[PDB]
Amino acid sequence: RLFINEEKILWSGFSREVPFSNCSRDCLAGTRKGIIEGEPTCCFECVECPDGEY
């Protein structure tokens, strides 16, 4: 149902870059999610993997 043309959207009226809203920077690679107590599952810690795993 939805159709959006991104080429004609001006973010904040001047910027041409899509903003960011995720509560947590993405884990890059070779790393594991973590848990922060008392906070929603959307927000994590990006812990590194144990030795001998991938």
Next chain:
Amino acid sequence: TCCFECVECPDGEYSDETDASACNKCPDDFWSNENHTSCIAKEIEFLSWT
């Protein structure tokens, strides 16, 4: 977040609480037990008189 699974800590890390949420690193000159529940001191090996 209320729903979770339990995974054992890796070698050299322990925990002593109900819901750990993280594996505590063993301090220096110590190593994890068989069950990863309490650090114990390492062993020194040398040609002794005993």
